[PDB]
Amino acid sequence: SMLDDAKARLRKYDIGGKYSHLPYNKYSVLLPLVAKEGKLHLLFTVRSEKLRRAPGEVCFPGGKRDPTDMDDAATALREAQEEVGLRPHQVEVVCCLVPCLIDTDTLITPFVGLIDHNFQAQPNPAEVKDVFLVPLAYFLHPQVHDQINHIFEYTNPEDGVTYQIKGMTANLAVLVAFIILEKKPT
Ligand SMILES: CC(C)(C)C1CCN(C(=O)c2ccccc2)CC1
């Protein structure tokens, strides 16, 4: 099946806990995969303009590890619940992808999660201004704008609204699309 095929592909890239004990300032993100209309999509947030890190930017759900978290996956899940209402029974964490090093002292660990078909986002306005889906296949043929560095523009066909996706977020989206969609029969 589509979903069993996705998980099987993702598991080949799982690094597990190999980099998780190193002495960094630690953040996690959740890359949430949603199946709609026979195709895979990624779920993105627009961050509230009020926040410390990355105000008004497109990002994946996530945040800083706290002492309550059992591990790095727990950080991702706690933050996704606070931002968009995703509950534990509504997500299966499939793997941990390569971490992202920034600012000399910070390590961001990305987890890929399969999202239940009855989940409906409830944006928390203190953290998130918007929540939106993008088909995973978009990231194979994106609409690129040079700002010099590369930005993606995605227009939602439901309503005509355009979103800009860039930086670590754009990079991780391309990675997941390559892992799941490369070399597939039609
Ligand atoms: C979505 C999530 C909250 C996980 C990101 C963490 C990293 N970000 C920073 O801006 C950053 C940069 C240097 C040090 C600390 C944070 C962007 C946002």
Curated annotation (Swiss-Prot):
A motif (Nudix box) lies at residues 64-85. One of its GO terms (molecular function) is manganese ion binding. Keywords: Hydrolase, Magnesium, Manganese, Metal-binding, Peroxisome, RNA-binding. Expressed in liver, kidney, pancreas, pituitary, small intestine, spleen, heart and placenta. Weakly expressed in brain. The record marks 53 as: Important for coenzyme A binding. Its EC number is 3.6.1.-, 3.6.1.77. This is Peroxisomal coenzyme A diphosphatase NUDT7. The gene is NUDT7. The chain holds residues 14 to 209 of 238 of the full protein.
